[PDB]
Each structure stands twice: as C-alpha cells, then as structure tokens.
Amino acid sequence: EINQPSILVLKEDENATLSCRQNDNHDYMSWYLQQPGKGLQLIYSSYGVKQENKGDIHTGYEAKRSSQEVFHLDIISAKKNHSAIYFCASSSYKGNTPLNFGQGTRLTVLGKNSEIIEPDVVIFSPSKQEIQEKKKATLVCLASGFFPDHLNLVWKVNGVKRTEGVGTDEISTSNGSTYSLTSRLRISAQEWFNPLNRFECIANFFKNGTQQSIQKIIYGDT
Amino acid sequence: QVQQEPSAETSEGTGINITCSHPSIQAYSIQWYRQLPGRGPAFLVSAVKGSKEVPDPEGRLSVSADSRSSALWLARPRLGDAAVYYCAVRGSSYTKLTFGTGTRLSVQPHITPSPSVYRLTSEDNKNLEMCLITDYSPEKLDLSSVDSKTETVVEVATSENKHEASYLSTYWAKKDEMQCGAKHEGFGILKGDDP
C-alpha cells in the first residue's frame, strides 16, 4: 500500500516535495535514487517521527518525517542532476529486515525554456492476414510526439487492467526532437472477434503541474 | 563497492547464477531483491551465512565462506522472472545497507519460428503505418536497416497450449517513407502487403 507519486516533471530552479505514505506502521522509511548504471543510493532515511538522516548523496535534498505514515523528500533548486527514478521504502525497523518499496516516482528536471508536449496516441487496426495465418490479433498502441522521454502506457480490456499478452517498450525511442513509445497487446482471434470487447490503451503523463491521461479505444470485430 | 554484472540471459527452464562481489565489505547479512517492470524492488531472500533456499523464484542463495560475495541461483527461470536483481549487503548489524548495481535478467522462451511481417494502419492517423514482425527467432531475425524498431515477448492463451510465447518487433514511419520487411535465416525475404 506504500504510496508515492507516479510521475513528476520540474523546471530548473524549482522547489518540489515528494511525499511517501505507508500504511504498515513502520518506523523506518527511506528515499532512494536510481539512475542508469548507478544502482540504488540512499538519499535520506528516517528512524522515526521527526527524525531524519542524510545519505551519501543528500546534497540537493532535505527531508521531513512529519508523522509515522508520511516521509517527505524536498527537492532544493531542481537541477538536471535531480532527474532520476525515486524509490521510497520502509521497514519495521533498521537491521536485517526486508524493505518494502513503492512503485517509484519518475522525476524529470527540464530547462526553463522547454515545454512539455502531450503524446499523440493511436491504436493500429490488427492485420486481417495475421488473424487468418496465426489465429491471433496483435493490437499496437503507439504514443508519439511527446516530451520528455518518460511516459506510461497501459491496457484495459472492458474496464479491467490487462497484462496477459501485453508487451510494452521499457524505454522511449528518440525520434528527432520528440519521443515515441509502443505497446502491443496480442490476443486470440476468438477474443478479437467480439464487437462488445473494448480494448483500451491509456497513456499517462505529466503536464501543467498535474497528472494527465489520454485514452484510446478500439472495439473487436464481428 | 557492491559489484554485479550489468545483464544476464538464459532460456526458459535453464538455471542461471547471478553473482554479487563486495571485496571491501565482510557482510553481516546479505539480501537480494528483484525489480519487475512497472514495480519497485521486491524482497526475495536474506541470509547471514551458508546456503538458503529461495521460495520464489525457485532457487538458492549461497554466501561465500568469507562473506565477501554471494550468488543467487535461479533453478527454473520463466518469462515472469525477467527482472533486475539487486544484492544488498550490511557490514554490521547496525550500519548502512549498501545495494549492488543490479543485474538485468532476460529469460528467452522456447519458440518454434514462423516469421511473418505485416503492415498496419490506424483510423486515428491515416498517414502513418506500423510494421509488425511476429513469431520469429531473435538471433535469426535481421532488422539491420532499421534503428527505430523495438522488440518484446508476449504470451497468448490458445486452445492447445495454455500459454504460448512469441516475439514481436515493430517500427513505424510516415506512410510514404515506410518499407515493411525483414530477413530471417531459413525463410528468405519477408515483406508486408495490405488487405
């Protein structure tokens, strides 16, 4: 249940707070930094309410354990060097006790000139030849045109989160000045040939200080 | 300080060893985590010495006699075990946990190839085409003439085989400037047509 923001985009020199919330009555909480090929590095930890400990890479950060449930990470004068995936973690106490991690916050620090561009989102009609030859339909959802590089793409089938048969690119493809991201949902022909089945690709991103989504739908055939 | 190989690869059902070396740290305790796509690191096993069985993913953790290294053995990796595996060591009961750089495990399902290529269109952007390459063998597919392609593996629930696995590659471009093809060992020239 440990909660932390999904995506955050900041401008240069901006201040911002990432707040982690846990419902396990854990005394230990912590904030970790993940950057490509730099493992997981402790930014700030807390052994209890209103107790904080600097990590090795704390320069540029402050933190406040406002209560047992909540541990704030403050970003001071946001810099390109801040861009990372941030993980909050908790445990009953420190010392050889498993840490419970959140799903992670992807933070991007932008130049005070660059704007955030929402993606264009299309679903491609599946190939009738593939359906005949392979008895399967591959639905390709493409998100393109967006900036910065981080964006989440998920599928829902008839209002329900779908993971079976989904392959989503882990990393965005740089196309000139913008990025794109692709997700494929491959389903059986029987599941495709139902005009009631609602196949929904959702792109979640961050724009204008808030989290936004674009939803694209394609229905099955008769 | 805590070193791991950046990546590892194995075929489904073929066990693989993931090492972790920390010569400058004589571990008081060793833990291993794995980070699945769209998730944060998740606890797998912890030990102070010797070898310890791992429930999920099935295998065994072995700590070196001098406690300056360990190894996570996955006995039966499946596609769902593809993740970034982290070791984390503690020099003392009371001191800091230090994480390794993480090893990105890739698990290749067994596949019977039947490479096919297809062109797709979308009603929302009619001046765009998507090239789909399916049911191929990754080491035999040639997509040399494209940099902007991406690849994945998915499982589909069919009649005869509860979950068959298949590779998929895609690349897209403005319709006019799109040429959907590939070359695949033992299948010659692959080219896409339309309805």
Side-chain angles (χ1 to χ4, degrees), chain A residues 1-22 24-222, chain B:
Chain A
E1 272 227 8
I2 179 159
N3 174 252
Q4 68 175 112
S6 95
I7 298 180
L8 190 67
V9 183
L10 300 180
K11 281 124 283 182
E12 213 138 61
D13 297 54
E14 239 194 277
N15 292 331
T17 292
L18 291 178
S19 307
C20 174
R21 300 158 196 279
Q22 51 115 0
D24 301 293
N25 197 40
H26 279 174
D27 295 335
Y28 186 83
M29 300 185 66
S30 60
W31 273 106
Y32 276 94
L33 189 99
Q34 183 189 73
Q35 297 174 311
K38 304 195 218 172
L40 289 167
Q41 305 180 240
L42 191 85
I43 309 173
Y44 253 100
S45 70
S46 170
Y47 302 149
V49 186
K50 289 155 173 291
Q51 198 284 321
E52 299 90 29
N53 303 290
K54 302 175 187 178
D56 262 319
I57 56 167
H58 73 84
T59 294
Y61 305 90
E62 294 183 35
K64 177 169 101 122
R65 178 79 174 274
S66 60
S67 64
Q68 179 78 333
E69 298 84 7
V70 181
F71 191 29
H72 300 280
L73 181 70
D74 293 321
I75 300 263
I76 308 305
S77 171
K79 294 277 144 285
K80 297 281 261 263
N81 165 224
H82 285 109
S83 305
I85 305 184
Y86 290 74
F87 284 101
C88 167
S90 86
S91 56
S92 152
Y93 45 70
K94 183 156 96 169
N96 198 8
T97 324
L99 287 168
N100 280 35
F101 280 82
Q103 281 165 172
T105 299
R106 171 87 155 108
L107 193 142
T108 316
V109 173
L110 280 206
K112 335 169 54 163
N113 39 289
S114 269
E115 262 218 309
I116 295 159
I117 308 153
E118 60 183 69
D120 294 286
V121 184
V122 303
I123 299 179
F124 286 86
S125 314
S127 175
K128 303 213 171 243
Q129 192 190 344
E130 170 190 33
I131 295 169
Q132 291 166 231
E133 292 175 0
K134 313 292 188 174
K135 275 184 62 133
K136 305 166 192 176
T138 303
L139 310 178
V140 187
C141 179
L142 170 69
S144 50
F146 59 87
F147 189 83
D149 66 327
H150 198 262
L151 174 146
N152 278 126
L153 213 56
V154 293
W155 287 93
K156 288 189 177 176
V157 177
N158 293 326
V160 182
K161 316 240 182 112
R162 171 76 162 256
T163 45
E164 224 76 67
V166 173
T168 303
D169 300 344
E170 287 189 69
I171 198 162
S172 300
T173 293
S174 170
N175 326 82
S177 174
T178 39
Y179 302 88
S180 75
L181 196 76
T182 303
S183 186
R184 289 129 302 222
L185 164 59
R186 198 169 202 197
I187 60 183
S188 71
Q190 37 274 82
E191 184 175 7
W192 167 248
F193 279 124
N194 188 338
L196 302 170
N197 278 348
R198 167 157 89 270
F199 301 100
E200 171 167 11
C201 173
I202 301 144
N204 302 298
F205 56 95
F206 185 92
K207 186 194 195 174
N208 287 318
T210 193
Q211 310 218 100
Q212 301 190 26
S213 298
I214 299 174
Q215 303 90 214
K216 215 64 198 197
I217 316 276
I218 188 165
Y219 283 89
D221 254 18
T222 325
Chain B
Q1 239 190 327
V2 183
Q3 300 155 282
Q4 296 184 248
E5 293 302 282
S7 55
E9 70 175 291
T10 192
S11 73
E12 200 161 24
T14 297
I16 190 171
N17 200 46
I18 305 185
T19 63
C20 174
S21 165
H22 40 97
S24 90
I25 305 182
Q26 185 153 64
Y28 173 85
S29 71
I30 291 166
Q31 295 151 231
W32 279 81
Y33 295 76
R34 80 171 168 183
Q35 176 200 157
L36 294 160
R39 283 218 81 80
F43 178 72
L44 300 180
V45 66
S46 162
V48 303
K49 68 173 205 162
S51 296
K52 191 176 183 183
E53 316 251 21
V54 181
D56 182 28
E58 190 187 310
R60 182 151 68 179
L61 161 73
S62 292
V63 171
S64 301
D66 65 353
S67 292
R68 299 183 184 272
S69 65
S70 79
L72 183 67
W73 170 253
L74 287 78
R76 260 174 219 91
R78 292 153 304 101
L79 182 53
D81 297 313
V84 176
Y85 287 79
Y86 286 100
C87 62
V89 307
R90 234 186 291 272
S92 91
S93 47
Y94 43 92
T95 43
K96 200 205 229 177
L97 191 72
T98 303
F99 277 91
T101 41
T103 293
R104 179 167 169 88
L105 175 60
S106 269
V107 176
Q108 290 135 222
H110 198 228
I111 55 105
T112 65
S114 204
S116 305
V117 172
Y118 311 99
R119 268 133 60 90
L120 316 181
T121 59
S122 152
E123 303 282 318
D124 318 307
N125 191 333
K126 300 297 312 142
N127 63 69
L128 256 70
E129 237 179 48
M130 176 75 70
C131 190
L132 176 66
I133 308 98
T134 74
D135 311 295
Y136 58 89
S137 167
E139 70 276 353
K140 296 189 185 184
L141 182 79
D142 187 59
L143 226 41
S144 44
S145 157
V146 202
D147 218 294
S148 42
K149 89 281 195 194
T150 42
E151 167 177 87
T152 326
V153 202
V154 302
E155 296 181 305
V156 181
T158 68
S159 277
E160 266 315 314
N161 323 57
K162 29 183 317 179
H163 288 118
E164 332 170 355
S166 58
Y167 278 80
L168 311 169
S169 278
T170 50
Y171 64 85
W172 64 274
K174 297 143 191 124
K175 182 164 297 180
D176 48 68
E177 35 199 302
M178 153 64 66
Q179 177 165 343
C180 195
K183 300 144 82 164
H184 193 288
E185 187 158 76
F187 293 85
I189 305 187
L190 300 178
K191 276 152 60 179
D193 51 355
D194 263 297

